[PDB]
Design an enzyme around this catalytic site. Structure first.
Site, mmCIF file in Angstrom:
data_model
loop_
_atom_site.group_PDB
_atom_site.id
_atom_site.type_symbol
_atom_site.label_atom_id
_atom_site.label_comp_id
_atom_site.label_asym_id
_atom_site.label_seq_id
_atom_site.Cartn_x
_atom_site.Cartn_y
_atom_site.Cartn_z
ATOM 1 N N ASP E 58 -9.652 -9.072 -27.381
ATOM 2 C CA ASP E 58 -8.618 -8.749 -28.352
ATOM 3 C C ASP E 58 -9.183 -8.770 -29.766
ATOM 4 O OD1 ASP E 58 -6.302 -9.272 -30.257
ATOM 5 O OD2 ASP E 58 -5.197 -9.036 -28.377
ATOM 6 N N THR E 91 -4.678 -4.174 -33.192
ATOM 7 C CA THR E 91 -5.425 -4.894 -34.220
ATOM 8 C C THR E 91 -6.819 -4.307 -34.409
ATOM 9 O OG1 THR E 91 -6.263 -6.532 -32.654
ATOM 10 C CG2 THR E 91 -4.117 -6.949 -33.651
ATOM 11 N N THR E 92 -7.518 -4.028 -33.306
ATOM 12 C CA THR E 92 -8.849 -3.439 -33.410
ATOM 13 C C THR E 92 -8.790 -2.067 -34.066
ATOM 14 O OG1 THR E 92 -9.539 -4.638 -31.425
ATOM 15 C CG2 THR E 92 -10.904 -2.789 -32.137
ATOM 16 N N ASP E 392 -0.173 -9.016 -24.325
ATOM 17 C CA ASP E 392 -0.321 -7.647 -24.812
ATOM 18 C C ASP E 392 0.442 -6.663 -23.931
ATOM 19 O OD1 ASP E 392 -1.761 -8.340 -27.010
ATOM 20 O OD2 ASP E 392 -3.689 -7.580 -26.297
HETATM 21 N N1 LIG Z 1 -8.353 5.018 -19.419
HETATM 22 C C1 LIG Z 1 -8.533 5.460 -20.685
HETATM 23 N N2 LIG Z 1 -9.146 6.637 -20.935
HETATM 24 C C2 LIG Z 1 -9.331 7.084 -22.190
HETATM 25 N N3 LIG Z 1 -8.932 6.418 -23.286
HETATM 26 C C3 LIG Z 1 -8.303 5.227 -23.182
HETATM 27 C C4 LIG Z 1 -8.067 4.668 -21.843
HETATM 28 N N4 LIG Z 1 -7.438 3.494 -22.020
HETATM 29 C C5 LIG Z 1 -7.286 3.314 -23.355
HETATM 30 N N5 LIG Z 1 -7.803 4.344 -24.045
HETATM 31 C C6 LIG Z 1 -7.806 4.467 -25.521
HETATM 32 O O1 LIG Z 1 -8.576 3.393 -26.056
HETATM 33 C C7 LIG Z 1 -7.838 2.665 -27.035
HETATM 34 C C8 LIG Z 1 -7.877 1.189 -26.677
HETATM 35 O O2 LIG Z 1 -7.555 0.417 -27.825
HETATM 36 P P1 LIG Z 1 -7.494 -1.183 -27.720
HETATM 37 O O3 LIG Z 1 -8.844 -1.682 -27.267
HETATM 38 O O4 LIG Z 1 -6.249 -1.535 -26.945
HETATM 39 O O5 LIG Z 1 -7.284 -1.591 -29.259
HETATM 40 P P2 LIG Z 1 -6.108 -2.606 -29.655
HETATM 41 O O6 LIG Z 1 -6.275 -3.753 -28.693
HETATM 42 O O7 LIG Z 1 -6.399 -2.953 -31.093
HETATM 43 O O8 LIG Z 1 -4.864 -1.780 -29.446
HETATM 44 C C9 LIG Z 1 -6.418 3.199 -27.048
HETATM 45 O O9 LIG Z 1 -6.107 3.695 -28.352
HETATM 46 C C10 LIG Z 1 -6.387 4.332 -26.046
HETATM 47 O O10 LIG Z 1 -5.985 5.540 -26.696
HETATM 48 MG MG LIG Z 2 -4.878 -2.921 -27.424
#
Ligand SMILES: Nc1ncnc2c1ncn2[C@@H]1O[C@H](COP(=O)(O)OP(=O)(O)O)[C@@H](O)[C@H]1O
Ligand SMILES: [Mg+2]
Ligand SMILES: Nc1ncnc2c1ncn2[C@@H]1O[C@H](COP(=O)(O)OP(=O)(O)O)[C@@H](O)[C@H]1O
Ligand SMILES: Nc1ncnc2c1ncn2[C@@H]1O[C@H](COP(=O)(O)OP(=O)(O)O)[C@@H](O)[C@H]1O
Ligand SMILES: [Mg+2]
Ligand SMILES: [Mg+2]
Ligand SMILES: [Mg+2]
Ligand SMILES: [Mg+2]
Lengths: 526, 538, 106, 211, 525, 49
Positions: E58, E91-92, E392
């Site tokens: 996270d 947040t990221t 989350d």
């Molecule tokens: N299976 C997947 N394939 C492609 N893109 C993805 C997949 N799962 C998540 N993502 C993308 O990666 C990002 C993950 O962000 P995340 O690590 O959750 O940041 P935060 O925790 O700050 O929201 C999302 O914005 C989403 O659009």
């Molecule tokens: Mg996230």
């Protein structure tokens, strides 16, 4: 042995002469230079590191000045006058500092030129009187009922802050809060925004969602889950005394010698609690707010009558609730009356925002108190928005008390400077030179506006001064964004007369106070 | 040009005491090295031929043991990856009770082979996926390797034979005697109800006569003394009281109010008469033994001695509960005489001295009772603690057998068969995960290798012989430690068998710990603090 | 051996492994047995031990002498423990047990 | 932490993106300081030595020498500018600015995951093309007095004040034309530079002899 | 410096120094947090001063656990804390967008451009971007499949694939259980309980309550099939008089009488409970369970156990509401009027013992409006990671339920927003077009970081995705396995609309505020 | 959030004892003040008086 002998104690420093005056004026100029760049609509942010670990991002001159620590007493006096200006009118904190610094800087010249400080002070006082006269002369009236004009005034007040892009919403919030807080009792007008206009900040959401409620909001929840969180038309009863069994203030002792006395005492405690709850219920309320704890048995008795109750609320919040919903706080439930029952709140809701519960007593009819629900990016952004809203509400209150306005953007400074210069031509004594020095030193505000705008100072200021020598040009100022001379009858940047009067008075008297200083003595204890 | 400044960004923003490790070499390889070091430290105590280890903790307390969990607990481990390995071992100990050294050895082997795979060019994700697939395949294979079941738990000799393998690793010299002791103790407990409680086994340590003089007692032993004159009862009728053996007092405040001379004259006489009446009423029910959890009043003790009542005081509430379970009584909250259902019965209660310790014994004669006690003798406290650890391992093995009766061959046979079959499966798997599967299979070699190294023979010859015998079609052949030359023998006949559930849980936990360690790519350690322990840990 | 910035055990941990540590343990056992060696037999002699407070203990008993000795060696403590065990279970032979164990080790 | 620190505990090491970031930061700092030097409209810098000597200068190489800097990349840039001054005698400030801007532009794409090597082939190809274009664009002229005066102006006006530069142009051009031999290398050791401290800066001149 | 002149021990950075410091700090934070984004990110390990181990992915946890003492870092941490508190995710992405906005702004400011024009462009681009986000959101009926997809897109990014697959079902089922129609969702009614005895895949949903305490009387029943639940907030232990009474007697018999008499008050309430239990169930088939928020003295425990009643003391405050919503009873603060209609019902109550701690399970409720999530793992850090992941996931599912719309993920929305901003740029008047371009480039960071974490190159993947979007007009994102453009809506990669709106608003506001900072002061000493 | 780091670039590369005054206010005004101070010290010795 045989210790040294001397008149005063050790580490008792003393400095005298013109060096003291030079040091004082230099300290004032340094204080002015600290916040010189935070004036005008194009001012930049400043980051302040709180000693306890906080961070303050602000454009307000008073906050910047009060967030720093200085050793020179003249700088201390400058901080004090900035705080005084902030407390009195609400805004103008950096303008007065700049004006005082400039006045002391121009008095330094006459101090160098063998002129005694008393003559300079007399000329300063004459100049202050004439500026007061000119400012009252060039003022214009304002009608209270015209809401658009009030909104424009608040906008011109907040165009220099960071809330300038949400100016419309901010002005509406400030105007509604100031109007609705306005109250009159026993023929005594009162606008107390410090106590009955509360600004609550909750990080998150969007700033466009921020609004002023027709009621109050507190960070409280129901005492028991079985208790309603949504009442349509609640009858509010306010208490500032605990609803629990407590010892008396006299040293009372029981002496038990019979078997049934212990249970009798405990049942008497329960019956006393039930008696208080029944006394409360006799008025048939819907919610009960207390500043002290409520016992669990009292909670059960209240729920038996289907009554909501909030356990512990601050004094100020309870006063705000009383003003908003028309209730009257009472201490002894046996003395409760129908008049004390608060009716007027059109809805009570306890909703969950984020991960914390909040209680809303909004939807009141004719409430005298309010909370300003602020939502934003983070805590520092919300703090700056709150400071800007405070400035807006102070300006609105000043306009409500005094319906006079004077042109902004340096137009007032230039007009008063021209009037002072014209009046100085009649004088034949030595006092005329410091008089004209004050007149031209008053021109620092448009010069600082031009400098912050990035435009050329010399030619723009010369053209503005030439314009102000014409017949009717008292409203000609300078754009803080485009860096061009414009009539303020078209731009619309007007500011309250009270703010300008306070600024000029504070600056002139700060210069007077720092001019009298000589023979600084330091090091002694109390 | 004589100093290298910190790079702009996170390097300068870091705190003065903090450390940041990122990438393969700085984080993954370092963690693998630390875990391998911990595994190598613990390796020498594996198997019956493992040597004991002298461990001195921060409080200068002696510890001699070849138990991996105890050694890990009494080592100030600072590397956090080793901390994960240690807590995985502790979880294995909590869930099963044996196989912690297996957990460390398997995790270390997996991590070194993962380091090799990373060096040759594989990615971390591929290694993790291969390890997970191989672990799933091993879990699928394991039920097919079960050789025999317990098939009886109320028997004495069969249970002793089953527990002999479990307690042969610890105290290798004399495991038959300890097997008989633990078998008797566990068979006394574990009634017709299927549930078995480990806490019902009690270990009493009295030194003096060597561990060969240890015995099992169907009752409880307390290192205390009787508070009265009576010190022996043959038909005990224990009445247990949680309250102190004294007249109860008001919980609010007690103040004797005297207003006349007669009250002052008669107060003490009335109090003493009330005490005498209460004690006589208790005795009239037949309760000739009284056990209390609080202090004993002087007058109450005198009147108990007058009526020939044995007094035992147990300060610990757990001991009181265990005594209530053993005798079959109920801890009364007040000093009222007990009704017949609350009156516990024991066949013999007496004061005795064992070695140079005065003890009180609540001895049953029937081969029953809720709680059985094992009295341990010996010449050294550390040796007796080691014997207690061995008894705990045996009891945990019995509990596991009650949970699951399936057994797998020991002495490396199960590990060799698992390695062979996982290698065979991975040889048929296309893609890059075949290398990871083969390495996971090879990681099973570390168990027979450690056994051979501890026994003093060449590991390579033993492993080659084991592969040959498993290839020709014998799945129950393991390392033969009773030989000076590398040799193997069938382990089903020898009775050297390990619990299937223990192996399953150990494999699962070791694989999970290895994968968790491998998943870490960046490490941010704060400045170390010498604080007075976390508040939760007191 | 490398500094290895992140270390496995706590800094200052002392470890001794192999044949040399066993030989040292045997030598420590002999040292302990020598301290009560001359107290055995009708021709035995007493030993006087002074504590920190200045109290002097004169005794021919092996267990008492070993108790008054403030041994800290982990292997040497076993001889004191078995002397205490012999005193507890029997009451005599506390000098003989230490000598027998040390002679076995030698 | 790194392999180097394992053998030498008291070793300072920056690896991978850290070294590139350090180099870019040093180059950008030098460029930021030396930006104000370029052009005749630049600003004087007052350089006070440890002993208290005052040196007002605008030259890039002189200013770099009087920097209080202890950075490796700064040392490399200083050496390059020193060679530039030793051989050609001009272009030190432009040297530093171009190096800094090259590094900044390269980092602009490197931060996007691009390897620096590709940027290096791009740089060498662009350098070759730029050299060809410079050969194409040069203006070959007969070096009469007017062209020499113009070049001396373009140098001195940047170096010093307007009228002082105007005087120095005539002085330098006349001296060079006096010592110049036809189709022979010019020996600059034959122009002695003598200084006195009794008149104004505009009183400097040329003597057709020796002092 | 003027501030240093007034205060000698003052640290001041002015003009370009302020921008350089702020942008360097933001870029450092962004560089640290690049590897977090996406399910293909790398887990980070956090060791505290006491040696506690923390594995996490996270952004907020990593930000809080980094050893940083920088002002701009504190500002970004506060922004991310608000983001996590209100929306629970992003947040990221928040940190990455802030850092890239500052970097793109510096890219133009270093060439002499004033930051005010950059901020004006940023704000105009933010308005246009919000308009486009409104135009692009997918208003859908939130059935089970869409919620499972959202929970997957969160948990897969936060934890392992199989663990994420289990937690998706757990979280979605819990949310569907506690949710009422057209009513705000109270996440306080889902109890997150940790057990440390089995594997991480054993985490499940119990349609009831799990309590971290058990019965304190050894003679109470360990398992009751059909139970009447009596949740209460009444003290069942001895209570002292508020007026300092004390006792006065003259003989031992009087002392005995006073001892027997002082327990009458509590014994009356115990007798009321016993009589209610007897009246409600006249046979041994049914059971009675008493859950009390206050303590119970051993005498009352014995009296209750003699009647076959299981009593639990010192329950959690929120457990009263949770039990009343799940079991269906009425929480009682007194026994003045207790009736069978205020008794809850549970289809099975039993106790589970784990080491030194004991747990009580209350399941088989007729229709539990409050449920509990049981986190099981072999390590404490595993439990903490799973708790963060389920938090989350619950936040994401609640946001999806509240806002009926949902936004395609995988960076497709970012690419479309950047394309729309570039198209709208000519309409912007003045030099604010540079700020609009910088805002678009900053928005384009998410696909870049996703491709970098997935192992591909930024430029080729980004140009491929942008060309595909321009040619087809669809919402094509990043395929983390192949790197080719992919329709996120079709494959089920979804993002919360509220999260995206909050990201835009907060990032733009904080970037505008930081860009206008020209001086950092520390003169409070 | 309690310290202001040195700005990247020239500020970090400056020597430990060196000083760098740049700009109008930081350099020109200070130089003018110093020259005015020197003139003030020497002023009183001017002329026959
Ligand atoms: N299976 C997947 N394939 C492609 N893109 C993805 C997949 N799962 C998540 N993502 C993308 O990666 C990002 C993950 O962000 P995340 O690590 O959750 O940041 P935060 O925790 O700050 O929201 C999302 O914005 C989403 O659009
Ligand atoms: Mg996230
Ligand atoms: N749009 C504008 N154009 C020109 N001048 C303006 C404008 N808005 C405000 N001003 C001037 O700026 C001043 C307000 O600046 P501000 O930062 O609020 O200083 P203070 O805190 O002292 O009021 C007013 O005196 C006004 O004359
Ligand atoms: N008599 C024996 N011959 C050969 N191997 C044995 C014998 N007894 C036990 N083992 C092996 O020793 C291993 C037990 O090692 P042990 O020291 O108990 O470690 P842990 O306590 O972690 O299980 C078992 O896997 C078993 O195969
Ligand atoms: Mg203002
Ligand atoms: Mg074992
Ligand atoms: Mg003898
Ligand atoms: Mg040049």
């Amino acid at each position: 042995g045989h210790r040294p002998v001397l008149v005063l104690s050790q580490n008792t420093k003393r400095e005298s002469g013109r060096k003291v005056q030079s040091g004082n004026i230099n300290a004032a100029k340094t204080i002015a230079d600290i916040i010189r760049t935070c004036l005008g609509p194009k001012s930049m942010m400043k980051m302040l590191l709180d000693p306890m670990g906080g961070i303050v991002m602000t454009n307000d001159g008073n906050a910047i000045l009060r967030e720093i620590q200085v050793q020179h007493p003249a700088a201390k006096s400058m901080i004090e006058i900035s705080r005084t200006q902030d407390e009195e009118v609400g805004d103008g904190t950096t303008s007065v500092i700049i004006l005082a610094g400039e006045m002391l800087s121009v008095a330094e010249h006459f101090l160098e030129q063998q002129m005694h400080p008393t003559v300079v002070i007399s000329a300063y006082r004459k100049a202050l009187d004439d500026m007061i006269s000119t400012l009252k002369k060039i003022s214009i009236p304002v009608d209270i009922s015209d809401s658009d004009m009030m909104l424009n005034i608040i906008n011109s007040s907040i165009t220099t802050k960071a809330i300038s892009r949400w100016s419309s919403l901010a002005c509406n919030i400030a105007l509604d809060a100031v109007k609705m807080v306005q109250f009159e009792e026993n023929g005594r007008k009162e606008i107390d925004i410090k106590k009955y206009a509360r600004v609550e900040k909750i990080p998150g959401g969007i700033i466009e969602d921020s609004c002023v409620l027709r009621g109050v909001m507190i960070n409280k929840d129901v005492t028991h889950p079985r208790m309603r969180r949504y009442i349509k038309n609640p009858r509010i009863v306010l208490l500032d005394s605990s609803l629990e069994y407590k010892k008396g203030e006299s040293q009372t002792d029981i002496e038990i010698t019979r078997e049934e006395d212990f249970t009798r005492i405990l049942q008497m405690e329960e019956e006393y609690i039930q008696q208080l709850c029944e006394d409360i219920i006799q008025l048939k309320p819907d919610v009960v707010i207390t500043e002290k704890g409520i016992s669990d048995l009292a909670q059960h008795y209240l729920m038996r009558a289907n009554i909501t109750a909030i356990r512990r609320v601050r004094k100020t919040d309870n006063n705000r609730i009383a003003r908003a919903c028309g209730a009257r706080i009472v201490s002894r439930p046996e003395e409760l009356r129908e008049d004390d029952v608060g009716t007027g709140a059109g809805l009570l809701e306890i909703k969950k925002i984020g991960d914390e519960y909040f209680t809303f007593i909004t939807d009141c009819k004719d409430p005298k108190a309010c909370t300003i629900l602020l939502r934003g990016a983070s805590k520092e952004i919300l703090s700056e928005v709150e400071r800007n809203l405070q400035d807006a509400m102070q300006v609105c209150r000043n306009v409500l008390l005094d319906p006079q306005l004077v042109p902004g953007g340096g137009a007032s400074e230039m007009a008063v400077a021209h009037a002072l210069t014209e009046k100085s031509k009649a004088m034949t004594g030595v006092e005329q030179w410091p008089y004209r020095a004050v007149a031209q030193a008053l021109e620092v505000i448009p010069r600082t506006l031009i400098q912050n705008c990035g435009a050329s100072t010399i030619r723009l200021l010369t053209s503005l001064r030439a314009k102000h020598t014409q017949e009717n040009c008292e409203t000609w100022g300078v754009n803080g964004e485009t860096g061009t001379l414009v009539d303020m009858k078209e731009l619309g940047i007007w500011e309250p007369l009270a703010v300008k009067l306070q600024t000029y008075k504070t600056a002139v008297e700060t210069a007077v106070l720092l001019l009298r200083i000589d023979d600084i003595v330091s090091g002694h204890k109390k | 040009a004589l100093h290298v400044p910190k790079a702009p960004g996170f390097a300068q923003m870091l705190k003065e005491g903090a450390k940041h490790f990122s990438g393969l070499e700085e984080a993954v390889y370092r963690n693998i090295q630390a875990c391998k070091e911990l595994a190598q430290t613990t390796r020498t105590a594996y198997g019956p031929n493992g040597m004991n280890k002298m461990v001195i903790n921060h409080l200068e307390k002696l510890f001699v043991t070849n138990d991996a969990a105890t050694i890990l607990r009494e080592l100030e481990v600072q590397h956090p990856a080793a901390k994960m390995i240690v807590m995985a071992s502790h979880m294995q100990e909590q869930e099963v009770g044996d196989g912690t050294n297996f957990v460390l050895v398997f995790a270390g082997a997996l991590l070194e082979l993962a380091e090799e795979l990373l060096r040759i060019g594989l990615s971390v994700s591929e290694v993790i996926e291969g390890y997970e697939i191989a672990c799933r395949k091993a879990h699928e294979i394991l039920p097919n390797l079960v050789c025999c079941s317990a098939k009886n738990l109320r028997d004495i000799d069969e249970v002793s034979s089953l527990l002999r393998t479990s307690i042969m690793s610890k105290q290798y010299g004399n495991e038959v005697f300890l097997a008989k002791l633990i078998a008797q103790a566990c068979v006394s407990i574990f009634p017709d109800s299927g549930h078995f409680n480990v806490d019902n086994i009690r270990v009493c340590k009295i030194l003096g006569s060597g561990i060969s003089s240890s015995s099992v007692l169907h009752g409880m032993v307390f290192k205390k003394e009787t508070e009265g004159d009576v010190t022996s009862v043959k038909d005990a009728k224990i009445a247990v009281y949680s309250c102190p053996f004294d007249g109860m007092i008001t919980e609010t405040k007690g103040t004797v109010l005297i207003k006349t001379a007669e009250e002052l004259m008669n107060f003490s006489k009335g109090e003493e008469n009330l005490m005498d009446a209460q004690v006589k009423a208790i005795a009239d029910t037949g309760a000739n033994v009284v056990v209390t959890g609080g202090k004993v009043a002087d007058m109450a003790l005198h009147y108990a001695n007058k009526y020939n009542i044995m007094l035992v005081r147990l300060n610990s509430k757990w001991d009181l509960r265990r005594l209530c379970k053993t005798v079959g009584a109920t801890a009364l909250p007040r000093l009222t005489p007990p009704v017949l259902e609350e009156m516990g019965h024991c066949d013999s209660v007496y004061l005795s001295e064992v070695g140079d310790t005065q003890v009180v014994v609540f001895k049953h004669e029937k081969e029953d009772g809720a709680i059985s006690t094992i009295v341990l003798r010996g010449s050294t406290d550390n040796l007796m603690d080691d014997i207690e650890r061995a008894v705990d391992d045996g009891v945990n093995t019995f509990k596991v057998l009650t949970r699951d009766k399936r057994l797998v061959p020991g002495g490396g046979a199960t590990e060799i068969e698992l390695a062979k079959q996982i290698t065979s499966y991975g040889e048929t798997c296309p893609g890059l995960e075949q290398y990871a599967i083969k390495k996971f299979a090879e990681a099973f070699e570390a168990i027979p290798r450690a056994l051979a190294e501890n026994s003093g023979v060449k590991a390579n010859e033993v492993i080659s012989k084991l592969y040959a015998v498993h290839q020709e079609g014998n799945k129950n052949v393991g390392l033969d430690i009773e030989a000076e030359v590398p040799a193997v023998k069938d382990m089903l006949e020898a009775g050297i068998l390990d619990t299937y559930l223990g192996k399953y849980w150990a494999i699962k936990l070791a694989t999970n710990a290895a994968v968790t360690v491998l998943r870490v790519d960046q490490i941010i350690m704060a400045k170390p603090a010498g604080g007075p322990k976390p508040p939760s840990g007191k | 051996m490398m500094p290895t910035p992140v270390i496995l055990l706590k800094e200052g941990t002392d470890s001794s492994q192999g044949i040399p540590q066993l030989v040292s343990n045997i030598s420590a056992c002999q040292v302990i047995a020598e301290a009560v060696r001359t107290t055995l037999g009708p021709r035995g002699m007493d030993k006087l031990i002074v504590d920190g407070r200045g109290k002097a203990t004169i005794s021919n008993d092996g267990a008492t002498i070993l108790k008054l000795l403030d041994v800290v060696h982990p292997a040497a403590k076993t001889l004191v423990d078995i002397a205490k065990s012999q005193d507890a279970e029997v009451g005599d032979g506390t000098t003989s047990v230490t000598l027998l164990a040390a002679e076995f080790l030698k | 932490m790194a392999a180097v620190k394992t053998l030498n505990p008291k070793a300072e090491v920056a690896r991978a993106q850290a070294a590139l970031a350090v180099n870019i930061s040093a180059a950008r700092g030098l460029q930021d300081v030396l930006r104000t030097n370029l052009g005749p409209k630049g600003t004087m810098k007052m350089l006070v030595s440890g002993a208290g000597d005052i040196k007002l200068t605008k030259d890039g190489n002189v200013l770099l020498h009087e920097m209080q800097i202890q950075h490796p990349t700064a040392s490399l840039i200083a050496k390059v500018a020193t060679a530039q001054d030793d051989i050609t005698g001009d272009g030190t400030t432009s040297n530093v600015l171009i190096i800094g801007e090259l590094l900044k532009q390269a980092d602009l794409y490197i931060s996007e995951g691009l390897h620096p090597r590709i940027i290096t082939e791009g740089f060498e190809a662009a350098k070759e093309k730029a050299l060809q274009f410079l050969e194409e664009v040069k203006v070959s002229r007969e070096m009469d007095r007017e062209t020499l005066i113009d070049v001396a102006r373009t140098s001195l006006r940047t170096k010093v004040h307007a009228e002082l530069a105007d005087v120095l142009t005539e002085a330098v051009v006349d001296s060079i034309l006096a010592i110049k031999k036809q189709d022979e290398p010019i020996d600059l050791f034959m122009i002695e530079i003598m200084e006195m401290k009794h008149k104004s800066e505009t009183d400097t001149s040329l003597i057709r002899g020796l002092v | 410096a003027a501030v240093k002149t007034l205060n000698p021990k003052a640290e001041v950075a002015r003009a370009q120094a302020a921008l350089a410091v702020n942008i360097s700090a933001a870029r450092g934070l962004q560089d640290v947090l690049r590897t977090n984004l996406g399910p293909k990110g790398t887990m980070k390990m956090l060791v505290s001063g006491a040696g506690d181990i923390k594995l996490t992915k996270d952004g907020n946890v990593l930000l809080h656990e980094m050893q940083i003492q920088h002002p701009t870092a504190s500002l970004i941490a506060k922004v991310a804390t608000a983001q996590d508190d209100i929306t629970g995710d992003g947040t990221t992405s928040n940190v990455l967008i802030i850092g890239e906005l500052l970097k793109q702004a510096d890219l133009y400011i270093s060439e002499g451009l004033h930051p005010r024009i950059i901020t004006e462009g940023f704000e105009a681009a933010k308005e246009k971007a919000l308009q486009f986000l409104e135009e692009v959101k997918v208003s859908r009926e939130m059935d089970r499949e869409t919620l499972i997809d959202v929970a997957r897109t969160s948990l897969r990014t936060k934890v392992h694939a199989e663990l994420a697959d289990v937690l998706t079902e757990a979280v979605v089922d819990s949310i569907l259980a506690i949710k009422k129609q057209d009513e705000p969702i109270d996440l306080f009614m889902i109890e997150i309980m940790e057990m440390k005895h089995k594997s991480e895949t054993d985490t499940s949903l119990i349609r009831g309550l799990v309590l971290d305490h058990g019965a304190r009387h050894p003679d109470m029943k360990k398992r009751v099939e059909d139970a009447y639940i009596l949740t209460c907030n009444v003290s069942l232990e001895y209570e002292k008089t508020e007026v300092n009474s004390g006792f006065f007697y003259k003989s031992a018999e009087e002392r005995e009488k006073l001892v027997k008499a002082e327990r009458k008050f509590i014994e009356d309430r115990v007798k009321k409970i016993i009589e209610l239990k007897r009246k409600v169930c006249g046979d041994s088939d049914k059971g009675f369970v008493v859950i009390n928020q206050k303590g119970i003295d051993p005498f009352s425990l014995d009296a209750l156990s003699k009647e076959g009643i299981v009593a639990l003391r010192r329950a959690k405050r929120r457990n009263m509401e949770r039990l009343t919503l799940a079991c269906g009873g009425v929480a009682l603060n007194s026994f003045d009027d207790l009736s069978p209609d205020c008794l809850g019902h549970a289809g099975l109550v039993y106790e589970y013992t784990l080491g030194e701690e004991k747990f009580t399970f209350i399941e088989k409720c007729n229709n539990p409006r409050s449920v509990t999530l049981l986190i099981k793992g072999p390590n404490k850090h595993t439990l903490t990671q799973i708790k963060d992941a389920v938090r989350d996931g619950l936040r994401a599912v609640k946001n999806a339920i509240d806002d009926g719309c949902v936004v395609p993920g995988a960076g497709a929305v970012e690419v479309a927003m950047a394309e729309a901003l570039i198209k709208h740029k000519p309409s912007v008047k003045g030099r604010a077009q540079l700020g609009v371009q910088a805002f678009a480039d900053a928005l384009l960071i998410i696909p870049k970081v996703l491709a970098q974490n997935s192992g591909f190159d930024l430029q080729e993947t980004l140009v491929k995705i942008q060309a595909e979007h321009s040619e087809s007009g669809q919402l094509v994102g990043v395929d983390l396995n192949t790197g080719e453009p992919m329709v996120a809506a079709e494959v089920g990669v979804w993002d919360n609309y509220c999260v995206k709106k909050q990201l835009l608003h907060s990032c733009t506001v904080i970037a505008t505020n930081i860009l206008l900072v020209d001086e950092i002061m520390r003169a409070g000493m």
